[PDB]
């Protein structure tokens, strides 16, 4: 254990901001099931944590694309390296919940 | 945008390992509903990403506790600082899925 953490630090580090998060390829690309991806996930900068109030929601305000190298494989066939671009979050912000 | 990321880097950084992840307090403590926490979430080192095969699963092998400072606030009442301990993941590893 690292003892009791400082209050001001828990809020600053937890407040809705862009943090390193791994996203599943199968979750973003639902039309790619026959080609096993290696790796099956990719690291993307997304917004995570919580808001200041219960009636708010941590969501992104800006976006961007990032190309990556993925090895697509298929049973009883072969393998191959391809270029895949994913969407990331550039800016984060809290806003009142809708649905 | 930056450019096409290196393959060896996407796998080494995406492979099931301990990464900074924010956990919701309400998700861990389902009994504390009458006392709103500030912040409502806390940063904990958990395992995230994906495994080498589809039949595997990224899960932790070891654990630990971490104390933090949280401000409990109740409607029409007052506020107060308390010590809350959360569970984190020390070691991560991939194993065949069960359910």
């Amino acid at each position: 254990h690292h003892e009791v953490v400082k209050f001001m630090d828990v809020y600053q580090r937890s407040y809705c901001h862009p943090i390193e998060t791994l996203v599943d390829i199968f979750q973003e690309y639902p039309d790619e099931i026959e080609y096993i991806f290696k790796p099956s996930c990719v690291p993307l900068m997304r917004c995570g944590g919580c808001c200041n109030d219960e009636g708010l929601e941590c969501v992104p305000t800006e976006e961007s694309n990032i190309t990556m190298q993925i090895m697509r494989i298929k049973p009883h066939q072969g393998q191959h390296i391809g270029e895949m671009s994913f969407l990331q979050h550039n800016k984060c912000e809290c806003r009142p919940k809708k649905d | 945008h930056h450019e096409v990321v290196k393959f060896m880097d996407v796998y080494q950084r995406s492979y099931c390992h301990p990464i900074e992840t924010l956990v919701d307090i309400f998700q861990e403590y389902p009994d504390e509903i009458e006392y709103i926490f500030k912040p409502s979430c806390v940063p904990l080192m958990r395992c995230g990403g994906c495994c080498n095969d589809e039949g595997l699963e990224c899960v932790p092998t070891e654990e630990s506790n971490i104390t933090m400072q949280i401000m409990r606030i109740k409607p029409h009442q007052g506020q107060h600082i308390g010590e809350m301990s959360f569970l984190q993941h020390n070691k991560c590893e991939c194993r065949p899925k069960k359910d």
Binding site: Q12, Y15, C51, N52, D53, L56, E93 | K38, M71, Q79
Partner: peptide, 19 residues
């Protein structure tokens, strides 16, 4: 210094005291 405590902004100490 007055009352510029935005709900969707870094609630400093003063804002926390008067939430």
């Amino acid at each position: 210094g007055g009352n510029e405590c935005d709900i969707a902004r870094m609630w400093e100490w003063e804002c926390f005291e008067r939430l």
